[PDB]
C-alpha cells in the first residue's frame, strides 16, 4: 500500500488527502490507531 509510509510522510493534516486517496475512509481509523499509539 505504502499508505502507511505515505501517511506517516504525508503532509501533516492532508493525511486527509492521502488516506482518502488510497481508499482509507478511515483516515479516521488511520489516525485512531496512530492515536491508540499517540493517544
Query: Which residues are near another protein by CB under 8 A?
Result: 11-17, 19-20, 24-29, 31-32, 35-36, 38-39
Query: What sections of 1-39 are H helices per DSSP?
Result: 3-8, 15-21, 27-38
* Shortest reach from residue 4's CB to another protein, in Å: 16
* Shortest reach from residue 37's CB to another protein, in Å: 8
Whole-number Å distance between alpha carbons of 21 and 5: 14
Q: How many CA atoms lie within 13 A of 24 on its CB side?
A: 21
* Shortest reach from residue 25's CB to another protein, in Å: 3
Which of residues 5 and 25 has its CB atom nearest to another protein in the complex? 25
Amino acid at each position: 500500500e505504502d499508505v502507511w509510509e505515505i501517511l506517516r510522510q504525508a503532509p501533516p493534516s492532508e493525511y486527509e488527502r492521502i488516506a482518502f486517496q488510497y481508499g482509507v475512509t478511515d483516515l479516521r481509523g488511520m489516525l485512531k490507531r496512530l492515536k491508540g499509539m499517540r493517544r
